[PDB]
Paper text:
RV is a non-enveloped double-stranded RNA (dsRNA) virus with three concentric capsid layers encapsidating eleven dsRNA segments. The outermost layer contains the glycoprotein VP7 and the protease-sensitive spike protein VP4, which define the classification of RVs into G and P genotypes, respectively. RVs use the VP8* domain of the spike protein VP4 to recognize specific host glycans in a genotype-dependent manner. Our studies show that VP8* of these genotypes engages the type I precursor glycan (Galβ1,3-GlcNAc) at a unique and conserved binding site that is present in all P, P and P HRVs, and the subtle sequence and structural changes lead to an altered glycan configuration at the reducing end in the neonate-specific P RV, that may play a key role in the age-restricted tropism of some P strains.
However, although the VP8* structures of P HRV (DS-1-like) and P HRV (Wa-like) in isolation have been determined, it is not known how they bind to cellular glycans due to the lack of their structures in complex with any glycans. To investigate how other prevalent HRV strains recognize type I glycans, we determined the crystal structure of VP8* of a G2P HRV alone and in complex with H-type I pentasaccharide at 1.6 and 1.3 Å, respectively.
Numbering used by the authors: 62 to 223
Amino acid sequence: GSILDGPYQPTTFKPPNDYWLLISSNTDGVVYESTNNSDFWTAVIAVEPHVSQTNRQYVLFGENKQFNVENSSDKWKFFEMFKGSSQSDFSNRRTLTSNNRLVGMLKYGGRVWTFHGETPRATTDSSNTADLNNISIIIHSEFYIIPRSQESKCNEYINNGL
């Protein structure tokens, strides 16, 4: 009784406004890398359950980066790593803890919205940008597309599973 647009194969593109990208995650590492090359960089890093503090390397926007990471929980963690200018540092802005292993990204009202917190009570949160139009995302896994008018379904998928 339900129809979902997708899956789409891993790709690089500029997502339209008003659509959720529901991005699957199939492994530890970089889930996606999104930037407009002016005031918005977000890369999501997946860390598998039960990882004690450890150093790992990730390729973010063409550069090798080292992060000390930890996941004490029995759920996957998806760390949003953000920087707000080209020469700013990355910081962990927000995190989704979820064994549903799905993350969401919406361009809407001059902002980027994502889900954070711990499922099944994950909620949406925003980052402001002056250049939404040029945000381009590299997605390293299969994803689906859900119109914002169907956000309630994206919420259910993120929180309760696909």
